[PDB]
Amino acid sequence: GFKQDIATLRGDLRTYAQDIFLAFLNKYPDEKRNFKNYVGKSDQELKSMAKFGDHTEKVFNLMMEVADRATDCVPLASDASTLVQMKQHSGLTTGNFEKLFVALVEYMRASGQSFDSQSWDRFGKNLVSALSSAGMK
Ligand code: HEM
């Protein structure tokens, strides 16, 4: 289930983090508008841009902590506050986060692996709700 999925992703977190974030950017090309430097790049090129590899690994390092600190796929309000408050996310709305989790769930659904994709779907919705409550637009 969800807690085992955290251990699976953490066991190869660099590859999962890149493959899910690329799934997100290819499913929602307009989302590259928050990045700029990513435009007109193939997946293999993106993987070779330092701010892609670094920022994608740090997204997934923190997302796995937030998942790990969750009860029944409900994140801590403190984790939502922390995320909202991040100066680098000034641009963002809950819409950016919803789309990332739609792509994550779709990626898990298409994998050959026994991920608990319905738990991730609820995690993504609960995190979007928590971010809104914590002040994200
Ligand atoms: C659980 C989800 C996410 C987490 C944990 C997260 C985490 C982070 C972290 C830790 C940083 C700082 C890392 C660093 O720059 O060294 C960062 C920067 C940034 N995040 Fe996020 N982020 C998340 C989702 C998103 C989403 C959905 C977007 C846009 C759709 C986004 C856009 C950005 C941007 C634009 C930056 C800085 C600009 C750059 O990449 O050069 N983040 N994020």
Side-chain angles (χ1 to χ4, degrees):
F2 189 68
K3 290 283 291 218
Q4 178 55 38
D5 291 347
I6 299 179
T8 301
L9 296 164
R10 272 172 172 168
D12 197 9
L13 197 56
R14 174 54 78 81
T15 77
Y16 284 121
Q18 289 186 333
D19 301 343
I20 294 164
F21 212 80
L22 287 169
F24 160 66
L25 296 171
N26 290 323
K27 189 177 177 67
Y28 299 109
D30 289 335
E31 294 290 316
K32 280 204 178 171
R33 297 275 155 289
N34 308 275
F35 292 107
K36 291 190 215 294
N37 31 249
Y38 291 180
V39 176
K41 288 277 174 79
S42 68
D43 290 2
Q44 290 303 268
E45 294 174 275
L46 280 174
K47 282 139 141 199
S48 273
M49 301 180 32
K51 284 193 185 153
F52 183 83
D54 284 348
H55 305 12
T56 74
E57 181 129 46
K58 276 179 198 155
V59 167
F60 275 80
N61 289 332
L62 175 58
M63 186 202 291
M64 293 303 100
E65 297 208 349
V66 177
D68 204 17
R69 281 192 293 268
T71 296
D72 287 0
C73 304
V74 184
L76 293 180
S78 55
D79 272 324
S81 183
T82 293
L83 285 167
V84 167
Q85 274 160 25
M86 285 178 62
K87 41 156 222 182
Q88 273 145 281
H89 289 165
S90 178
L92 305 184
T93 75
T94 57
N96 303 121
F97 290 81
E98 195 263 1
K99 287 171 180 81
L100 174 56
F101 282 95
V102 172
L104 182 148
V105 170
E106 184 185 290
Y107 170 93
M108 287 179 171
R109 291 206 155 128
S111 80
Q113 309 193 246
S114 61
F115 287 109
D116 177 9
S117 67
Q118 289 272 78
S119 287
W120 288 94
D121 193 33
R122 300 164 35 212
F123 178 66
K125 288 187 177 133
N126 293 342
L127 184 56
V128 160
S129 304
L131 288 173
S132 183
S133 298
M136 174 170 297
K137 223 358 117 58

